[PDB]
């Protein structure tokens, strides 16, 4: 029994059906001519003219219900071109004809057929093909205006807004994308996302096209949310250096100020936190942007205000027990000259602003590194270090790794985790005790012994990179990003443990394999909750160690791919954590629960082999024997894992020596001399001589230490120019040495010379050679210069280096 429903609609479904065999499956010059080729891909193009008037036009009512229940249902056991199999023809469309391919995109909307799997390939949901950004830019000009028309289904609104975030903006002189926005400024929470993908993308928002049309659809959003755009405009966006970007977001932050103050006072507190409206006047006095723009600095002082030895003690209480300020390289200063006999009695007490803590280290090593010894940096080390010990006392006894898979499915030892961890007044405390443990564990490498962290509050110290970063993983599952700040300030207390040599070594042993396993578990979910947009993936013994053995496999295939600063590939990370996250996927496979399996290469394990690993651990592989070796594609995958990778304890180096002698077909002779190159260099490393990531190759000045120097008026010559040259490379230099974001991380990793201590980079100050770029460490030729063979090696006309 056909309706006559029924009957038309197959009958025009089934001719898109044969017009495309034959445009992708029939060749171009053999059955077919051009001239007979202009006129059979114009058969397609007014027919497809057809299907788009009959489902919009409203008169054809019985026809639209019956595609419907069609495309959701699959042929009559194959006797039909199913609505699968078509869609295979029109992917292969996108290129020879593009503007063909932007009238089927138009046909599946109106059906409701939103289906995300077709919808990523002809947008790439994380030189350039030039018939695809047609298309590519063609069908996110036509989804946007699909949502703006029935926008009462919010599953849609959520995915185009953080998925797409540089093409939705980038879009904006459309009257299709123009009337997406729109109704997101109409819309209470659907405004609240939009502005959470742009401090995710500030990294390319940097052009001077695309910057202008941000304010554009920046410029009027709800008054729910004009709290979150003025943490924006001051953080992120007011410092470039477009004198017509610095002086049209005036006109925008002044302006959501003064709607405020005519509105409630009831919503508009809890709307900008008192907690958060002193860190803002704080950016603003250390650098010169309040004295800059002076209208914006004289709305934000009226809304506050409507909502002598022992003299001066009490002075400086009124900014450091308090909630939180802006005054933090202003607050640092004040607690300094504090009598310096009493720091814990006038530091350690009911609450002190643990931001005044962390910004409190730094200032007392410059102090350190000039002359005597710090009132200020001593008694902040006895602080930074007791309050981390008893969040751990208050962690739970026996520790099991962190699964966002399969969360409570293991026990009910997730129960005391989200009351006792899980407060969001213990939330807030991590990452205000995070900045503490970043800037301790960089001036390490150039303190004296006193400050050095103890033995015996080591394993404390292992203990709370684990747990604060998986603080980071709970609240991406629940409520939204941490802050994106607390993304970063969380990420550099685990960068700086794993360079140590004190605190490496413990991640190491036998008692922490859930701890070594969970930041594996935790990396991975922080670099796929934010790179791998939904359906996709990154590139293209008990069972948790090896789910945390096949999870550091992926993301070193993806430091060619995702994590390379610059691909295209890396448009989706905000490039604020490539520096971060590029260092610690690195040494996370440097651990011997991990590194065995990390240098088999991927085309290995689809072939026969897989022996069994013992180690008194999980995965203890032999090395790779010399007969897999003999494929040029399976040989260039095993010296991508040993570069990147580095070795380890001596006896591995040894290992890699063998492996390579006997495959010295001249495909494969020629990719092998550049492999000894290689191993040879990680012995020529300053410190630890086999890490690239704490490291890179020594170089040696062929220019002299000047003379210049060394007088009574020449050793004030030194003291100058010191504090010049060091916030240049701050700017100016490019950071292959440097991970984290801090500030004075000078460091030139030129030997003294029989080789000793490390030279700092305020001693060399005029050492290095004009060859080279700021401060981008790598081979140019002129690494060891003549004057470091011959005193070194005493000739003038752990490794056995000798030996090699």
Known sequence: KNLPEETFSRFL??????????????????????????????ELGTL????????????????TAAATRLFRSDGCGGSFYTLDSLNLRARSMITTHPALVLLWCQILLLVNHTDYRWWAEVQQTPLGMCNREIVRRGALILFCDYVCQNLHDSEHLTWLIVNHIQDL??????????????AVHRNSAASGLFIQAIQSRCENLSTPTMLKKTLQCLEGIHLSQSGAVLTLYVDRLLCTPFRVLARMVDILACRRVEMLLAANLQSSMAQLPMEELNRIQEYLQSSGLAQRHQRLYSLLDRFRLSTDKDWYVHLVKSQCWTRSDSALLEGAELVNRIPAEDMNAFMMNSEFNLSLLAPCLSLGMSEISGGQKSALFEAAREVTLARVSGTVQQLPAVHHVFQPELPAEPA????????????????????????????????????????????????????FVVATLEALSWHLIHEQIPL??????????????????GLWSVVSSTEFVTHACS?????????????????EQLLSNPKYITAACEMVAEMVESLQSVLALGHKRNSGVPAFLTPLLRNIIISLARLPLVNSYTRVPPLVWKLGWSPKP?????????????????????????????????????????ETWAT??????????????????????????????????????????????????????????????????????????????????????????????????????????????????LGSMSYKLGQVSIHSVWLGNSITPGVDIHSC
Request: proline content about 6%; some cysteine; charged content about 20%.
């Open 13 to 42: 479904l089934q001719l898109v059906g044969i017009l495309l065999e034959d445009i992708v499956t029939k060749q171009l010059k053999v059955e077919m001519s051009e001239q007979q080729h202009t006129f059979y891909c114009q």
């Open 169 to 182: 903006i980038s879009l904006s002189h459309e009257p299709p994308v123009q009337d997406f926005i729109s």
């Open 519 to 535: 930041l594996i578990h935790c990396v991975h979910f922080i670099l796929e909750a934010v790179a791998v947009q939904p359906g």
């Open 614 to 654: 013992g180690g008194d651990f999980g995965t203890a592989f032999p090395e790779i024997p010399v007969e897999f070796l003999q494929e040029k594609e399976v040989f260039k995958e095993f010296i991508y894992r040993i570069n990147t990778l580095g070795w380890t304890s001596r006896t591995q180096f040894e």
């Open 48 to 63: 497809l003219m057809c299907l788009i008037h009959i489902f919009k036009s409203g008169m054809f009512r019985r026809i």
């Open 412 to 463: 009910a030892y997730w129960s005391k985790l989200n009351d006792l961890f899980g407060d969001a007044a213990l939330y807030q405390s991590l990452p205000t005790l995070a900045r503490a443990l970043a800037q301790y564990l960089v001036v390490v490498s150039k303190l004296p012994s006193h400050l050095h962290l103890p033995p015996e509050k080591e394993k404390d110290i292992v203990k």
């Open 660 to 773: 390579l002698l006997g495959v010295l077909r001249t495909q494969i002779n020629v990719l092998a001399v550049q492999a000894i190159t290689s191993l040879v260099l990680s012995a020529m490393t300053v410190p630890v001589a086999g890490n690239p990531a704490v490291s890179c190759l020594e170089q040696q000045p062929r220019n002299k230490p000047l003379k210049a120097l060394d007088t009574r008026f020449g050793r004030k010559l030194s003291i100058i120019r010191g504090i010049v040259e060091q916030e240049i490379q701050a700017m100016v230099s490019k950071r292959e040495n440097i991970a984290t974001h801090h500030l004075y991380q000078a460091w030139d990793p030129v030997p003294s010379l029989t080789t000793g201590a490390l030279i700092s980079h305020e001693k060399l100050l005029l050492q290095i050679n004009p060859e080279r770029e």
């Open 484 to 501: 994106s700040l607390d993304l970063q300030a969380g990420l550099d207390c685990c960068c700086l443990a794993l360079q140590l040599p």
